[PDB]
Paper text:
In this cycle, the C-terminal tyrosine is removed by tubulin carboxypeptidase (TCP) and can be religated by tubulin tyrosine ligase (TTL). [name] possesses a non-canonical Cys-His-Ser catalytic architecture. A positively charged groove around the catalytic pocket on [name] is found to target the tubulin tail for detyrosination.
Two copies of the [name]/[name] heterodimer were observed in an asymmetric unit, and they are structurally identical with a RMSD of 0.16 Å. In the complex, [name] folds as a single α-helix associating with [name], and [name] folds into two interacting domains of roughly equal length that form a V-shaped configuration. In contrast, in the non-canonical Cys-His-Ser catalytic triad of [name], the distance between the serine side chain and the Nε2H of histidine is extended to 4.3 Å, so that the imidazole ring would not be well oriented for thiolate/imidazolium ion pair formation by serine/histidine interaction. Instead, the imidazole ring is oriented indirectly via a water molecule, by twisting the ring to rotate a degree of 45.6. Approximately 1314 Å2 of the [name] accessible surface is buried by [name], which is 36% of the [name] surface participating in the intermolecular interactions (with the total accessible surface of [name] being 3652 Å2). By analyzing the electrostatic surface of the [name]/[name] heterodimer, we found that there is a continuous positively charged groove surrounding the Cys-His-Ser catalytic triad pocket.
Residue numbers in the entry:
A (entry chain A): 49 to 299
B (entry chain D): 28 to 60
Write the structure that this text describes.
């Protein structure tokens, strides 16, 4: 679909394309678009305040504030992604885009939310962050989704954004990386998606090297071909290496 | 220009609300089938 590459304000080419995609998708497209565009009395959306960690906060309450900020930005259902995310760009370049998301304050999709989640948790050394990617199959098509796994005080959880409430944030109550991943697999089932690939990245450093990117694919499992005990065996081995060993990036 | 950014933001959020309701409706209709 469409990705804004023109900054803010969005330029005519990108803006007109956005409206043409939604007029097509929506059953009452033309009258829908006509009712919004140059409508004189649209509501001005509030600007949510950027959450910030203080010692007076539990880290679950802080993570909840981060997730609530992302939910307030809303999942982007327009078909036009407003912030370009080059996955392999250095972290320092991605954090400037995260900051731009806070300033422009627009809806976001799953990958933007992962970048945003890294940015809003960089201060805090008791949180380890690592991307969790899914390639799924539904009705003859492949789908790609990613969330931000988090590790804190022996527990696993996640931040993220999805069309589906069960496919983004998970509380910090998962005792193992496998329980977290399996919860996403079971959640995908509810939507008739089969998980083809699970990809787990490395910890995103709180203090990255100058050109250091995110490692998205340190572990790749073809889960649809594996029995669950083999999946758990591979995940727990890898998660144990994460928690101890310094692993060499695989990309 | 800031005024254009604000105008665009207001239309983006009206549009996102409409597309969100559409996606919810389509989800429900697919469950019914």
């Amino acid at each position: 679909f469409h990705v804004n590459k023109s900054g803010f304000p969005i330029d005519s080419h990108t803006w007109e394309r956005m409206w043409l995609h939604v007029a097509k998708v929506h059953p009452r497209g033309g009258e829908m678009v006509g009712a919004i565009r140059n409508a004189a009395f649209l509501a001005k959306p509030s600007i949510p305040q950027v959450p910030n960690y203080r010692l007076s906060m539990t880290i679950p309450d802080w993570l909840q504030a981060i997730q609530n900020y992302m939910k307030t930005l809303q999942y982007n259902h327009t078909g036009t992604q407003f912030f370009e995310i080059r996955k392999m760009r250095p972290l320092s370049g991605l954090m400037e885009t995260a900051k731009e998301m806070t300033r422009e304050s627009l809806p976001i999709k799953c990958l933007e939310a992962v970048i945003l989640g890294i940015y809003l948790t960089n201060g805090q050394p008791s949180i380890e962050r690592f991307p969790i990617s899914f390639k799924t199959y539904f009705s003859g098509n492949y789908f790609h989704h990613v969330v931000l796994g988090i590790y804190c005080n022996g527990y696993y959880g996640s931040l993220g954004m999805s069309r589906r409430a069960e496919l983004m944030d998970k509380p910090l109550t998962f005792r193992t990386l496998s329980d977290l991943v399996f919860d996403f697999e079971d959640s995908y089932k509810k939507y008739l998606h089969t998980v083809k690939k699970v990809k787990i990245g490395l910890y995103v450093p709180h203090e990255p090297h100058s050109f250091q990117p995110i490692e998205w694919k340190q572990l790749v499992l073809n889960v649809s071909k594996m029995l669950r005990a083999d999946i758990r065996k591979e995940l727990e081995k890898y998660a144990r290496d994460m928690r101890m060993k310094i692993l060499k990036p695989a990309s | 220009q800031q005024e254009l950014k604000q105008r665009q933001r207001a239309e983006i959020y009206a549009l996102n609300r409409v597309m969100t309701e559409l996606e919810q409706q389509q989800f429900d209709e697919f469950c019914k089938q």
